[PDB]
């Protein structure tokens, strides 16, 4: 199976910052990659467009994907509110890794995080399913607006998103 | 100025540390689950006729980061040790928190209150007598709470302030 590529156009207080694109590892986690792909195109009628990165912790990660409650507690998958951990083949090996947020085993929805450092203690607990292809400097720039506990000092949004390949 | 008390709320994930703290500070119940990274709050209150400032650290229950707690345990003056009455694992976790506080502070006299939360829920699995006995063995108060109904919320935090006051004057 061929790995698709999706993009987010990131905005800061409504002003463009830049584009981040992601390779999705459909060749290892097809169901998890397909969820993120479909949420990025919006083709099911809902998805990431307009949602925010609610937690940015410099040195660690940027987390977003709550397009249902917009408060860090929500989100849903294309399969229902939650779906199972597909596998843990891929690991949190360094900056750029794209991985599923969760609230314990088998609670994947739509929330995700982009690592800005290696976060190996999450291995085997969070499903890694992609990596930044272009625009890692934009993810780095998003760290300008984070904090120790992740509260953001400006509103960081996915102004647009979709599929490139 | 009024005395400031550095209170720290600890316990396993999901027991209601944030719900209790937000009830105290903001007078509403958070029904959704927003697992905490680390949050701080401040409130002035009157306890036993003396106005004081509560500085409350609401900590994460995440088991993965137990080593990261030492820093805030050294800084904190008193600890609310919270479990959920419908979660026996959370009650067993209490011992590890108490021992960690005792180790990090190097003292048996650390101001502490044992809090059994979620007393509005019907599915009790931790006996009240179990919790009472544990608190007695530690020599600390035990308070039953519900962040949902607000039962015992003020009592838990105010009792902890009283324990700090007794400790500072002992
Ligand atoms: C102890 C402090 N502390 C740290 C931490 C730890 C460290 N280390 C640990 C590792 N050491 C190496 C071994 C030596 C170095 C020092 C340093 N400094 C810190 C921070 C900055 O000190 C404040 C963390 C951390 C994480 C949590 C709570 C406290 C935490 C936490 C709470 S909730 C969660 N984790 C999982 C969360 N779940 C939800 O959001 C559910 C919500 C509801 O249902 C859908 C949605 C989720 O999926 N993610 C997606 C994945 C990254 C993850 N969030 C997150 O934010 O991690 C933050 C962070 C910083 C990576 C880790
Ligand atoms: N019925 C009931 N539910 C409660 C009570 N306290 C908390 N809850 C619920 O339990 C869940 C977890 O509460 P929360 O305050 O986030 O717990 P926490 O101990 O802060 N968790 P963490 O360590 O991850 O930050 C929430 O859905 C909350 O509404 C209570 O007294 N009664
Ligand atoms: Mg909390």
Author numbering:
A (entry chain D): 1 to 165
B (entry chain A): 0 to 169
Authors' own words:
RAS family genes encode small GTPase proteins that regulate cell proliferation in response to growth factor stimuli. Here we describe RMC-7977, a reversible, tri-complex RAS inhibitor with broad-spectrum activity for the active state of both mutant and wild-type KRAS, NRAS and HRAS variants (a RAS(ON) multi-selective inhibitor). The binary CYPA–compound complex then binds to active RAS (with dissociation constant Kd2) to form a tri-complex structure in which CYPA sterically occludes RAS–effector interactions. Although neither RMC-7977 nor CYPA alone exhibited any measurable binding to GMPPNP–KRAS, RMC-7977 makes multiple π–π and hydrophobic contacts with RAS in the switch I (SWI) and SWII region once the tri-complex is formed.
Kd2 values for the most common oncogenic RAS variants were all within threefold of those for wild-type proteins. No binding was observed for GDP-bound KRAS(G12C) in vitro, and stabilization of GDP-bound KRAS(G12C) with adagrasib treatment prevented KRAS(G12C)–RMC-7977–CYPA tri-complex formation in cells. Similar potencies were observed for inhibition of RALGDS, PI3Kα and SOS1 binding to KRAS(G12C), KRAS(G12V) or KRAS(G12D), as well as SOS1 binding to wild-type KRAS. In KRASG12V and KRASG12C cells, inhibition of additional markers, including phosphorylation of RAF, ERK and the ERK substrate RSK, was demonstrated. In these cells, there was evidence of durable pathway suppression and apoptosis induction after 48 h of treatment, indicated by sustained pERK, pCRAF and pRSK suppression and moderately increased PARP cleavage. Additionally, RMC-7977 inhibited the growth of KRASG12C cancer models that are resistant to KRAS(G12C) inhibitors owing to restoration of RAS pathway signalling. Overexpression of wild-type or mutant RTKs in NCI-H358 cells (KRASG12C, NSCLC) conferred reduced sensitivity to adagrasib (proliferation inhibition EC50 shift: wild-type EGFR, 42-fold; EGFRA289, 153-fold; HER, 51-fold; FGFR, 18-fold, RETM918, 34-fold), but not to RMC-7977 (proliferation inhibition EC50 shift ≤ 3-fold). Furthermore, we demonstrate that concurrent inhibition of multiple oncogenic RAS variants and wild-type RAS in the same tumour cell with a reversible broad-spectrum RASMULTI inhibitor such as RMC-7977 can overcome some of the resistance mechanisms recognized to limit the efficacy and durability for inactive-state KRAS(G12C) inhibitors.
